[PDB]
Amino acid sequence: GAVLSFHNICYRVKPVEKEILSNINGIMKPGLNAILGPTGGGKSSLLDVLAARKDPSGLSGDVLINGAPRPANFKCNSGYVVQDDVVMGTLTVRENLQFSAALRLATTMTNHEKNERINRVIQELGLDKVADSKVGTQFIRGVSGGERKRTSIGMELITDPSILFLDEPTTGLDSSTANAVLLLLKRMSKQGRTIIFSIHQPRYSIFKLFDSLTLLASGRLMFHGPAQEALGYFESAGYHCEAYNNPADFFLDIINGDKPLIEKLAEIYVNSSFYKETKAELHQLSYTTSFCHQLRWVSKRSFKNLLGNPQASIAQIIVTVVLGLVIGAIYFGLKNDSTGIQNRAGVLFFLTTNQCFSSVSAVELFVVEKKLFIHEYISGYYRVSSYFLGKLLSDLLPMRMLPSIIFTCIVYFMLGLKPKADAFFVMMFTLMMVAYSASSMALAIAAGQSVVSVATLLMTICFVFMMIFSGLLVNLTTIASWLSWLQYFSIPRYGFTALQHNEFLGQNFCPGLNATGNNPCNYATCTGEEYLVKQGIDLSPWGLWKNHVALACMIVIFLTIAYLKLLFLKKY
Amino acid sequence: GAVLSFHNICYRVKPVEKEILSNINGIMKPGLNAILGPTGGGKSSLLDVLAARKDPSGLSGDVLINGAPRPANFKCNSGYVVQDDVVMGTLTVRENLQFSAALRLATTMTNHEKNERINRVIQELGLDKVADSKVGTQFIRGVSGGERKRTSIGMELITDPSILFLDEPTTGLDSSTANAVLLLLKRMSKQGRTIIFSIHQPRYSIFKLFDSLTLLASGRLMFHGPAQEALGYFESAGYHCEAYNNPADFFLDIINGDKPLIEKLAEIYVNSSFYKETKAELHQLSYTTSFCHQLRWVSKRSFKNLLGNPQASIAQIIVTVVLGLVIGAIYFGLKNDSTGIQNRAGVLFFLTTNQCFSSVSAVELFVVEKKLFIHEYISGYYRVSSYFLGKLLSDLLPMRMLPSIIFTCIVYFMLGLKPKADAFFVMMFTLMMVAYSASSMALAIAAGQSVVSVATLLMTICFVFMMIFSGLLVNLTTIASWLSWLQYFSIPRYGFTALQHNEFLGQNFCPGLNATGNNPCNYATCTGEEYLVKQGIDLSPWGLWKNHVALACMIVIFLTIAYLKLLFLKKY
Ligand SMILES: CCCCCCCCCCCC(=O)OC[C@H](COP(=O)(O)OCC[N+](C)(C)C)OC(=O)CCCCCCCCCCC
Ligand SMILES: CCCCCCCCCCCC(=O)OC[C@H](COP(=O)(O)OCC[N+](C)(C)C)OC(=O)CCCCCCCCCCC
Ligand SMILES: CC[C@@]1(O)C(=O)OCc2c1cc1n(c2=O)Cc2cc3c(CN(C)C)c(O)ccc3nc2-1
Ligand SMILES: Nc1ncnc2c1ncn2[C@@H]1O[C@H](COP(=O)(O)OP(=O)(O)OP(=O)(O)O)[C@@H](O)[C@H]1O
Ligand SMILES: Nc1ncnc2c1ncn2[C@@H]1O[C@H](COP(=O)(O)OP(=O)(O)OP(=O)(O)O)[C@@H](O)[C@H]1O
Ligand SMILES: CC(C)CCC[C@@H](C)[C@H]1CC[C@H]2[C@@H]3CC=C4C[C@@H](O)CC[C@]4(C)[C@H]3CC[C@]12C
Ligand SMILES: CC(C)CCC[C@@H](C)[C@H]1CC[C@H]2[C@@H]3CC=C4C[C@@H](O)CC[C@]4(C)[C@H]3CC[C@]12C
Ligand SMILES: CC(C)CCC[C@@H](C)[C@H]1CC[C@H]2[C@@H]3CC=C4C[C@@H](O)CC[C@]4(C)[C@H]3CC[C@]12C
Ligand SMILES: CC(C)CCC[C@@H](C)[C@H]1CC[C@H]2[C@@H]3CC=C4C[C@@H](O)CC[C@]4(C)[C@H]3CC[C@]12C
């Protein structure tokens, strides 16, 4: 079996440094081990500390498995259940179990066998009635909290872990289901699996199931040893219970007071035989799956989440179509007359801005998953690179490409723009590039930010500032010499400039050309080239492709920054 | 005392109609009355049904207080605690208690006395350590769940209610605090207060506190009567417990199975003496505070929430200032030259759009409170009109007015616009009006909508469509005769038109005027009046003020629509 141990553990949290956990020692031999205590004692903190999930800065003690230190593949053989559930709502139960099993369990086993285990676990936890039901979403009524909790438990139970940690496995579950869950854990722990869990308000039948007990309170350790001997240990010191029915309530009624009480009990413990014995024993003793597989399964999960979140995919497509048709009707039949310039520039500007501002929604779905991503990374699911590229090939690439195609296909021929294929495809390509660059910038800004409202604000502000330098609201030749340099950071500038260059080039907007020919007018701006020059634009085709290479470089740089912001993030 | 009763209750929920509650009967005499049952049984549903919070369409039975029907002032003397807490996070505990006491309790009592009661309740619930701490927020670490729950309880406990309903008063609380809470309830119920509550996993000491028991399961009623006699009732029929320690666990172990089991037990009950007796008894028996006070306290709460939510007030002000300065630097020194027209129109358009699009954030804070508003309305806090006007005088009026002032004060003199006071104040007034109209439209759209992402999408789309008709992106004289009518629904059109009219009117943009004077150029658009005409604008001052009256009418109409959308909302 696995004989976990610890000695002289202490912990600190930061400015001022608070000591959540003080001197703690104990041994957790195979079987069933529990951690009772009141709220705020330090239950969850200790549990994470034992499962290598707290920053090692505060930790100041030795955690040893079987005497030898922590194995490097430790996280590949231990499961951890979270106090607050982390389960993708837009998926079903079975999808999530398949995902966890697929990424964590080895791929030598056939898919039929993994599905077999999944069915077995569903039976064990009593989830047949909601096996295929969707977990909670803001649009669909969610499954009951108990079923969600059992799902979180199963996602880790399927891994066949030799060591298992649970933080409040039974919170909100009715008594019968909780009894079923714990009987299952006992049946499993009688095979060598070393289980460690916290719990609130057990019943006596449960309390007889224990094999080792730990009692945390205000950081300090009150008692550690066999479950049976705890009552007698207290009996000797005092509190002749003889009246309470459930020993757990009795144990807490002493912590809660029913010189300082905490210190008194803790010193009684350190003067107990149990602590001497455990100090004696302590002193005496002292990735699974390749890159491609991770990428594929992450991308599939994101496919499903995106299709199930119908405010960034379907709403976006529909509004794009409606806008395209409306624009087509409004600007219909563009004329080479006085009004031609205004309409043409306006439509191009609108398309550019809409592409730029349509990326906020997609990244926002990337922000919310932060916590989920951290939990899944620590647990040992996927690398960082895999998660990044997966979310890219699932969200950024597919959905952002379509709007440009639809917009151009509808608009170009209704309005009456340049009647050449080259211009058509150039317009489509340019819109794609601005869209991707905006999404990249949003990812860079919003990567590793917990809150969405702040990120949305920042991105919106940045886009506004970029828009002021587009080329239509202000003429860029009037910009002061000490601020024109800012115009090179503007995505809309490159997109709009490139769209204007390929449209106005072969155009003349003064209808009377013989009349215009004899005496041209100084302040007339008849032709497209003159307007182009006045806005400060080159005429050479290099003057067009320069914007595209700039956009590509921006894409590369911003994606790299996002990857690093994720990499040096605090995953603890 | 208060002798509640019910008879033949049934309930339905809708398309297909599901019957959540079947035949139910019982009496809840003064004292302590509990409602045990498993998840999904119908606990919360029954509790709401008894407290007049379910739509009366499904209800099909008689709820009688002391034989006489439900008094009209019933909600003025009964408190109701919610299963999921509804407590304003941005406030402290004491602020919330003051708010509830101020609006619900009468104003004859002095404020010192109300504060006295608040302190007493804080002592009763054990919240001295977190009395002034802020409740959970997305920026500040939140207080523990137990303290939040106790706060929700106190907000209703302070009312001195003759009848009190609780849905899971003790969920997540540690045993000691829960014991304290229930001992408090018992001490209070021994004075005539009739308490009715649900609960999960009581302990035996608690179970002895009961005076009446109700056992719901899958809608059906399993047992109703004195707490003591329940065990013997089962004993007679079966299940010779004699082994379980806590009777509550025993009672549920029979519902959960530890021809159909549910129907069998229910029929055993209807064949019991208890049901005969209660059927016999049933057959035998068968605003506080004015408008101004509500308005003031609602407005104060919104002051505090807005100042505590630093993403719609402080961020907005700061970004406004930064944008104003940047604009001032960019367009600095506008010249009456060829470029004058483009820069002038662009700056005006930008200000208009920014005012229009800056209203999404404020309304979004109005959306999230929907659920809270419904709960507070039903409980009997405030009228609808009060809540509306309060949120208006707190959020819409103050914050939306400032941006225009700041924008104009900074911009007008840096750029070099019309050097006349009249134009300055006209510009300020116009910006105010567009801002208010946009906020009104957002309120109309977002009133009575549960989700924020959908509302944000809708408002953004509407503003975009309005913007396409502003007057700059497209010339409105080229619009087809069968779509120009849509331009009269555009707020930015009125604002932008009014800003342009008072600026370009006294301007000439062709620098060589003697050169221009001898031979004017057809396609020249030198003066401001010509450009104004070409965009399709009247020159008479009525041609300016018409936009303002239109904006005012839009404001009035949209606010009225919002009020009605709230009024005919389903408050049940
Ligand atoms: C003048 C108008 C035209 C020019 C507009 C320029 C926009 C540039 C946008 C890209 C910047 C970027 O990508 O920011 C990248 C930075 C990089 O973060 P980090 O340093 O690696 O943090 C490391 C974190 N650790 C320690 C955990 C690793 O992300 C941020 O700081 C997030 C906030 C950025 C706000 C930027 C607002 C800029 C407003 C400019 C107003 C004049
Ligand atoms: C060219 C410039 C275009 C400008 C368009 C501006 C439209 C503004 C209308 C506001 C009406 C309003 O807000 O009314 C309020 C309505 C609902 O009202 P209700 O049914 O009474 O709900 C009360 C029901 N109760 C009483 C039972 C509770 O909200 C909405 O419908 C929100 C959807 C509006 C979508 C607008 C999309 C426009 C697309 C146009 C494509 C050509
Ligand atoms: C989508 C229309 C447009 O992109 C455009 O092409 O013209 C200009 C402009 C636009 C959108 C927005 N703004 C603008 O000035 C300001 C703005 C704020 C928005 C906010 C508030 N931000 C200031 C954080 C949102 O929450 C959601 C969408 C938002 N969209 C916009
Ligand atoms: N990262 C942290 N930053 C600040 N305070 C913390 C941090 N982690 C814990 N604490 C503080 O330590 C105290 C106890 O936290 P802890 O995680 O141990 O809860 P707990 O004892 O396990 O009870 P429960 O399971 O119900 O959450 C709390 O007051 C908490 O504020
Ligand atoms: N408005 C509703 N729409 C759809 N289903 C509903 C609605 N109200 C109740 N139900 C369903 O009726 C069943 C019983 O719901 P109920 O509210 O009574 O549970 P409960 O008594 O509150 O238990 P608990 O408080 O622990 O969650 C549930 O399956 C629930 O989904
Ligand atoms: C119908 C037209 C005229 C409306 C204009 C387009 C916008 C306002 C409409 C078009 C289709 C709509 C979507 C249609 C379907 C869904 C799925 C539903 O579970 C939530 C709302 C949501 C996401 C709608 C949001 C609003 C929406 C995007
Ligand atoms: C951290 C982020 C914002 C870095 C910003 C880097 C951007 C602005 C850099 C990356 C590559 C650069 C471009 C490289 C080459 C060209 C072609 C030249 O004939 C004009 C300048 C131009 C177009 C540069 C403009 C600035 C540019 C686009
Ligand atoms: C481009 C310029 C104008 C950006 C303006 C950003 C300023 C105005 C915004 C951006 C993010 C905002 C911060 C977001 C979160 C917090 C944490 C909170 O505990 C105090 C307020 C504080 C610190 C906000 C203050 C306002 C803030 C700093
Ligand atoms: C439910 C919502 C969309 C109501 C829409 C009502 C708006 C569009 C109505 C309300 C008041 C109306 C305005 C009242 C007076 C004038 C002045 C006149 O010289 C031109 C028309 C104009 C400007 C009207 C246009 C239409 C108008 C603005």
The 3-class secondary structure across A138-197, one letter per residue, is: CCCCCCCHHHHHHHHHHHHHCCCCCEEEECCCCCCCCHHHHHHHHHHHHHHHCCCCEEEE
Approach to solving: cryo-EM
Q: Which of residues 6-45 of B touch A (CB under 8 A)?
A: 38-40
Q: Tell me if A86 sits within 8 A of A152, measured CB to CB.
A: yes
Alpha carbon of residue B41 to chain centroid: 29
φ and ψ of B163, to 5 deg? -140, 135
Rounded to whole angstroms, the Cα distance separating B174 from B78 reads 27
* Residue A417: burial class (beta carbons within 10 Å; 0-12, 13-18, 19+): buried
The whole-angstrom distance between residue A191's C-alpha and the CA centroid of its chain comes to: 36
Give the residue ranges of DSSP H helices in A199-313.
204-209, 227-237, 247-255, 261-270, 273-285, 291-307
Query: For chain A, what is the radius of gyration of the CA atoms?
Result: 32
Task: Report phi then psi at B482, rounded to 5.
Answer: -95, 10
SS3 A203: coil
In sign, the C-alpha dihedral spanning A418, A421, A423, A428 is positive
Q: What is the 3-state secondary structure (H, E, C) of B39-61?
A: CCCCHHHHHHHHCCCCCCCCCCC
Query: What are A460's strand-pairing partners?
Result: none
- Long-range pairs of A313-319 with CB within 8 A, sequence gap ≥ 24: A313/A399, A315/B457, A316/A358, A316/A361, A316/A399, A316/A403, A317/A402, A317/A403, A317/A406, A319/B457, A319/B461
In DSSP terms, A221 is beta-bridged to A216
Q: How far is CA B430 from the centre of its chain?
A: 31
| Strand arrangement, sheet containing A31-36 | A78-80, A163-166, A194-198, A31-36, A212-217, A220-225
Any ligand 1 atom below 6 A from CB of A464: no
**Residue-range domains of chain B with CATH:** 1-77+202-286 (3.40.50.300), 291-504+525-567 (no CATH)
The answer to whether B1 touches B217, Cβ cutoff 8 Å, is: no
Rounded to a whole number, what is the distance in angstroms from the first to the last CA of chain A?
A: 28
In sequence order, what are the residues at sequence separation of 6 or more whose Cβ sits closer than 8 angstroms to the Cβ of residue B404?
B355, B428, B431, B432, B435
Pairing verdict, β A18-28 and A78-80: unpaired
- Give the residues across from A5 on adjacent strands: A27, A64
In angstroms, the CA B373 to CA B445 distance is: 17
Contacts of B521 in chain A (CB under 8 A): 521-524
Mutate to test the interface with B, among A522, A525, A530, A533 (most CBs of B within 10 A): A522
Q: How far apart are CA B130 and CA A395, in angstroms?
A: 44
DSSP A56: T
DSSP A339: T
Provide the H-helix boundaries in B204-313.
Answer: 204-209, 227-237, 247-255, 261-270, 273-285, 291-307
| φ, ψ at A308 (rounded to 5°) | -90, -5
Residue pair B434/B320 in contact by the 8 Å Cβ criterion: no
Cα B130 to Cα B143: distance, rounded to the nearest angstrom? 8
What is the SS3 assignment for B469?
Answer: coil
- Compute the distance between CA of residue A347 and CA of residue A521 in angstroms, rounded to an integer: 27
Cα separation, B514 vs B519, in Å, equals 9
Locate tokens 């000797």: which residue?
A236
Tokens of B141: 């670490």
Concatenated DSSP letters of B75-107 = GGTEEE--SS----TTSBHHHHHHHHHHHHS-S
Q: Do A457 and B311 touch (CB under 8 A)?
A: yes
* Beta strand segments in B346-442, E: none
Which tokens belong to A295? 């990428």
Per the structure block, which two tokens stand in for A132?
Answer: 């295929």
Reduce the DSSP state of residue A217 to 3 states and report it.
strand
Is A524 part of the contact surface with chain B (CB cutoff 8 Å)?
yes
Cα atoms in the Cβ-side hemisphere of radius 13 Å centred on A481? 0
Mutate to test the pocket of ligand 9, among B443, B459, B549, B553 (most ligand atoms within 8 A of CB): B553
In chain B, the N- to C-terminal Cα span, in Å, equals: 28
8 Å CB contact between B65 and B71: yes
> Phi and psi dihedrals of A199, rounded to 5?
-170, 155
Kindly report the number of other CB atoms within 10 A of residue B529's CB atom: 16
Instruction: Say if residue B499 is exposed, middle or buried (CB neighbours under 10 Å; 0-12, 13-18, 19+).
Output: buried
- Cα–Cα distances in angstroms (integers) from residue B156 to residues A169, B97, B116, B169, in the given order: 32, 9, 16, 12
CA of B343 to the centre of ligand 7 (A): 26
What number of other Cβ atoms are within 10 A of residue B245's Cβ? Answer: 14
- Nearest of B160, B155, B204 to residue B182 by alpha carbon: B204
- Measured CA to CA, the distance from residue B389 to residue B294 in angstroms comes to 10
CA A28/CA B121 separation, integer angstroms: 44
Q: Token match 């004292």: residue? A: B31
CA atoms lying within 13 Å on the CB side of residue B54: 23
Type of residue numbered B266: A
> Exposed, middle or buried, B69 (CB in 10 Å: 0-12/13-18/19+)?
exposed
Length of chain A as a residue count: 572
- The residues near A238 (Cβ < 8 Å, ≥ 6 apart) are none
Main-chain dihedrals φ then ψ at residue A34, nearest 5 degrees: -120, 155
CB of B86 closer than 8 Å to CB of B372: yes
Ligand nearest to the CA of B217: 5
As a dihedral over the C-alpha atoms of residue A152, residue A154, residue A156, residue A161, rounded to 10 degrees, the angle is 150
- Cβ atoms of B294 and B302 within 8 Å: the answer is no
3-state secondary structure of B529: helix
Count CB-CB contacts under 10 A for residue A269.
Answer: 19
Residue A205: closest C-alpha in chain B: B244
The arrangement of strands across the sheet holding A4-13 comes to A18-28, A4-13, A62-65
Q: What DSSP string runs through A356-410?
A: HHTTHHHHHHHHHTHHHHHHHHHHTS--HHHHHHHHIIIIIHHHHHHHHHHHHHH
Amino acid identity of residue B163, one-letter, is I
SS3 A331: coil
Distances (CA, A) of B279 to A239, A372, B29, B67: 48, 54, 15, 14
Instruction: Round to whole Å and give the CA distance between A282 and A279.
Output: 5
Cβ atoms of B165 and B379 closer than 8 Å: no
Beta strands in B283-425 (DSSP E): none
For ligand 8, residues with CB inside 6 Å are: A 454, 461; B 139, 310, 314-315, 318-319, 322
Contacts of B454 in chain A (CB under 8 A): 311
Using CA atoms, how far residue B53 sits from A212, A223, B151, B215, in Å, is 48, 48, 22, 21
| CB-based contact A3:A30 (threshold 8 Å) | yes
Q: How far apart are CA A451 and CA A240, in angstroms?
A: 52
> Cα–Cα distance between B442 and B367 in angstroms, integer?
10
Where is chain A broken, named by the residue before each break, C–N > 2.5 Å? 14, 258, 286
Task: Using a CB–CB cutoff of 8 Å, tell me whether B162 touches chain A.
Answer: no
**Cα distances (angstroms) measured from residue B328 to each of A485, B345, B425, B499:** 17, 15, 18, 17
- Report how far apart, in Å, the C-alpha atoms of B470 and of each of B359, B435, B546 are: 18, 15, 16
What is the rounded CA–CA span in Å between residue B457 and residue A312? Answer: 10
The one-character DSSP state at B198 is E
What are the C-alpha distances in Å from A37 to residues A22, A163, B313?
Answer: 15, 22, 43
User: At A542, which helix (H) or strand (E)?
Assistant: helix A542-567
Cα–Cα distance measured from residue A152 to residue B130, given in angstroms and rounded to the nearest whole number: 32
Task: Using the CB atoms, write b or e for A174-197: b if 16+ within 10 Å.
Answer: bbbbbbbbbebbbebbeeebbbbb
- What values do phi and psi take at A87, rounded to 5? -140, 130
> Would you give the distance in Å from CA A121 to the centre of its chain?
26
**Looking at chain B, how many residues does it have?**
572
* Main-chain phi, psi angles of A363, to 5 degrees: -65, -30
CA atoms of B236 and B229, how far apart (whole Å): 11
Report the gap between the CA of A163 and the closest CA in chain B (Å). 27
Query: What pairing do the DSSP bridges indicate for beta strands A62-65 and A4-13?
Result: antiparallel
- Report how far apart, in Å, the C-alpha atoms of B546 and of each of A257, A467, B551, B552 are: 75, 31, 9, 10
Contacts of A39 (CB under 8 A, 6+ apart): B144, B146, B174
Those of residues 418-477 in B touching chain A at CB distance below 8 A are 451, 453-454, 457, 461, 464-465, 468, 472-475, 477
Instruction: Using DSSP, state whether A475 is helix, strand or coil.
Output: coil
- How many Cα neighbours within 13 Å face the side chain of B380? 23
Half-sphere exposure of A488 (CA within 13 A, CB side): 8
Report the residue of chain B nearest A326, measured CA to CA: B465
Cβ(B361)–Cβ(B471) below 8 Å:
no
Chain A nearest CA to B256, separation (Å) = 7
Separation of alpha carbons B563 and A256, rounded Å: 51
A252, A38 Cβ separation under 8 angstroms: yes
Instruction: Report the candidate in A456, A448, A459, A440 with the shortest Cα–Cα distance to residue A560.
Output: A440
Write out A491-555 in H/E/C secondary structure.
Answer: HHHHHHHHHHHHHHCCCECCCCHHHHHHCCCCCCCCEHHHHHHHCCCCCCCHHHHHHHHHHHHHH
Q: Output phi, psi for B158, to 5 deg.
A: -70, -20
Q: Mapping DSSP to helix (H, G, I), strand (E, B) and coil, where does residue B566 land? A: helix
CB neighbours of residue B209 within 10 Å: 18
Pairing of strands B163-166, B78-80: parallel
Q: Quick one: tokens of A27?
A: 């041994």
Q: A465 CB less than 6 Å from ligand 1?
A: yes
Residues closing a segment before a gap in chain B (C–N exceeding 2.5 Å): 14, 258, 286
| CA–CA gap between residue B100 and residue B90 (Å, rounded) | 15
One-letter-per-residue 3-state SS of B412-467: HHHHCCCCCHHHHHHHHHHHHHHHHHHHHHHHHHHCCCCCHHHHHHHHHHHHHHHH
Q: What sign for the dihedral angle of Cα A134, A137, A141, A142?
A: positive
Burial group, residue A412, by CB count within 10 angstroms (0-12, 13-18, 19+): middle
Give the gyration radius of chain B's Cα atoms. 32
- What CA–CA distance (Å, rounded) separates A470 from A465? 9
Q: Which of B39, B140, B175, B241 to mutate to test the interface with A (most CBs of A within 10 A)?
A: B175
- The answer to whether the beta carbons of residues A34 and A199 sit under 8 Å apart is yes
